[PDB]
Design a protein around this ligand. Structure first.
Ligand SMILES: CC(=O)N[C@@H]1[C@@H](O[C@@H]2O[C@H](CO)[C@H](O)[C@H](O)[C@H]2O)[C@H](O)[C@@H](CO)O[C@H]1O
Ligand code: NA
Length: 619
């Protein structure tokens, strides 16, 4: 809503968040941001996947072997390059609107223009605690103490005060109309620049006909027609910009070759083609065996806007996807609400699937089951099901798979999840020998340049992969539903926790050049999580105002952990959560903490760690 955008930049000006809070000011900051990331970030993983995807494990080995803080000076004076290397207009606007809100939350001034900044008294914060007990329970139902959530409550109350100022300015509607008229022109200009950045099948919801041959002159009309095409190596399917595919879905079982991949994309002019699945695109998921915990749901119907079922040598690019529920009989937090995906990837009957790539997808309002962790449930979820006959087709798993440039907003439960496998019970040791990955695990997994925001559960998680590279991702405001207010009927599933960007049962994972802000309080709610897995390294990551702190080392199977050359600015709760972990080497980081935010997070402090040569500032 343009009046809310206008109001936000009015507050930004009064807070001094940005020097120029005109629409041109927004445009120049966007241009500056993209030019900076292009000049200063690493080049690896930019451009065609054929030029780098085979080198992911090699670049991971090189970066893990670094012996000093690369560009330490930039990192320490606040001009390092991290987060997504290109921000779309939609990513950038949402990022700045969140920046303004968080600046209000930490503002110490008396006034914002004529608005007197409320000073939240102990009485007022304690009253909020007593009235919102459903927000302060942990994994096992035990409450955080008031003292543990005092500063988080003040942050929340200042965010509400901020939000009330926006609707107030909106209510009070001259130069607002000027500001908004100019913003629309700038927005269109930005969309024009964004847009600038076998057989060809054309599909047009507006001009097509499913009886056509599917040329640009006589395009197909519907995704159902696409679902019926016998797509061959080299084929392209191009969806017309401006198209809306109402209640439609793409369910594909197609294979290109290395030499002639299949491409799904956009053509023409206007908005990204919109797949508006609205809870249709039904299919039956079955892992074929219980998962790592017997309580995890592992079979049932899923709604997916885009289902890639045993696909290979396929790239999907430049689409907008939603998957809203709200069908008759359904409530939002219902225990068995259908699992929903924006893009679901499945490996089952073709052994290793090669060369699946998602690029520049805008996936929002995917209203999956609030609870279920391992059904294909969230914005993007790739999994591996037990093959019909593994002795004939091989272990179902992934090789050379990338998720790049995707924007996720309001997806539940997961943001981006890649790799959960029916072979999960083969990895139930602390140490994970390389042979487990040679037989059962994924190779050359690359997740980069994504923006995940307002996510029900975890932001980005890579699973069962050898040396995955998760880099140059930006995350805001994940774990929104990991609390009793939304997580109403978990039954025996537990799982009321989420962290930002992290690996599960990976070997020698590298998470680097990521940015994570404003994780929503739960027992976890830290930015980074060296979870169960072997050899995880976080380096060159930026974290800010996460309500569960900076980094966790999670229990006895989180082994060979290292956390170096990271910057943490005003993480809350407690900076490090060494929770029952056997080791963690925490060294050569820079932390900025409030005096009343401890280095070690309460109740998550009984693990083994070496913290040395860290620079801890008070703020
Ligand atoms: C060991 C542990 O408790 N780790 C937590 C994570 O929970 C595990 O996540 C994996 C995901 O593949 C399985 O679901 C497993 O059964 C869970 O125990 C949890 O997701 C993260 C993020 O909050 O943190 C740990 O608490
Ligand atoms: Na294969």
């Amino acid at each position: 809503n343009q009046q809310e955008i206008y109001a936000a930049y009015r507050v930004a000006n009064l807070l001094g968040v940005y020097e120029d809070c005109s629409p041109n000011g927004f445009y120049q900051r966007w241009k500056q941001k993209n030019a900076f990331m292009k000049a200063q970030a690493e080049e690896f993983g930019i451009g065609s996947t054929d030029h780098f995807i085979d080198d992911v494990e090699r670049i991971v080995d090189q970066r893990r072997a670094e012996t000093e803080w690369k560009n330490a000076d930039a990192w320490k004076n606040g001009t390092a390059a991290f987060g997504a290397r290109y921000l779309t207009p939609e990513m950038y606007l949402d990022y700045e609107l969140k920046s303004i809100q968080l600046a209000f939350a930490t503002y110490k001034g008396e006034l914002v223009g004529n608005h007197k900044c409320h000073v939240y008294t102990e009485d007022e914060k304690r009253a909020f605690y007593d009235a919102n007990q459903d927000l302060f329970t942990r994994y096992h139902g035990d409450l955080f103490s008031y003292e543990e959530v005092d500063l988080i409550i003040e942050k929340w109350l200042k965010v509400q005060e901020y939000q009330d100022i926006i609707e107030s300015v909106v209510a009070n509607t001259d130069n607002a109309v000027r500001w908004i008229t100019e913003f629309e022109k700038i927005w269109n200009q930005m969309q024009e620049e964004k847009r600038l950045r076998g057989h060809c099948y054309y599909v047009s919801s507006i001009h097509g006909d499913d009886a056509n041959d599917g040329t640009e002159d006589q395009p197909l009309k519907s995704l159902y027609a696409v679902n019926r095409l016998d797509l061959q190596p080299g084929d392209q399917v191009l969806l017309e910009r401006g198209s809306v595919f109402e209640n439609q879905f793409l369910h594909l079982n197609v294979q290109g070759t290395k030499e002639q991949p299949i491409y799904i994309g956009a053509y023409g002019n206007g908005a990204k083609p919109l797949i508006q699945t609205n809870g249709q695109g039904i299919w039956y998921q079955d892992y074929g065996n219980e998962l790592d915990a017997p309580t995890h749901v592992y079979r049932g119907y899923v709604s997916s806007a885009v289902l890639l079922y045993d696909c290979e040598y396929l790239t999907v690019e430049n689409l907008e996807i939603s998957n809203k529920g709200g069908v008759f009989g359904e409530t939002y937090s219902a225990p068995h609400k259908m699992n929903r995906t924006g893009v679901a990837g499945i490996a089952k009957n073709r052994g290793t699937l090669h060369e699946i790539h998602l690029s520049n997808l805008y996936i929002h309002d995917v209203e999956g089951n609030v609870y279920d962790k391992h059904m294909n449930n969230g914005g993007i979820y790739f999994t591996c099901l037990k093959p019909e006959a593994e002795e004939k087709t091989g272990v179902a798993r992934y090789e050379n798979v990338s998720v790049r440039g995707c924007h996720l907003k309001r997806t539940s439960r997961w943001g981006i999840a890649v790799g959960y496998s029916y072979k999960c019970k083969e990895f139930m040791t602390a140490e994970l020998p390389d042979e487990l990955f040679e037989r059962y695990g994924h190779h050359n997994i690359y997740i980069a340049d994504n923006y995940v925001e307002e996510i029900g559960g975890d932001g980005i998680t890579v699973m069962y992969a050898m040396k995955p590279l998760v880099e140059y991702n930006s995350g805001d405001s994940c774990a929104l539903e990991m609390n009793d207010r939304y997580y109403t009927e978990p039954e025996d599933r537990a799982g009321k926790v989420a962290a930002g960007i992290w690996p599960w049962k990976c070997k020698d994972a590298l998470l680097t050049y990521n940015e994570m802000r404003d994780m929503r309080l739960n027992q976890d709610s830290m930015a980074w999580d060296a979870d169960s897995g072997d050899g995880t390294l976080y380096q060159y990551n930026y974290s800010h105002l996460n309500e569960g702190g900076c980094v966790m080392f999670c229990l006895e199977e989180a082994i060979h952990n290292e956390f170096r050359y990271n910057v943490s600015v005003d993480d809350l709760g407690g900076l490090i959560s060494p929770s029952g972990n056997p080791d963690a080497w925490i060294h050569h980081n820079v932390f900025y903490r409030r005096a009343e935010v401890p280095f070690v997070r309460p109740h998550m402090d009984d693990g083994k760690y070496v913290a040395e040569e860290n620079e801890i500032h008070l703020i």
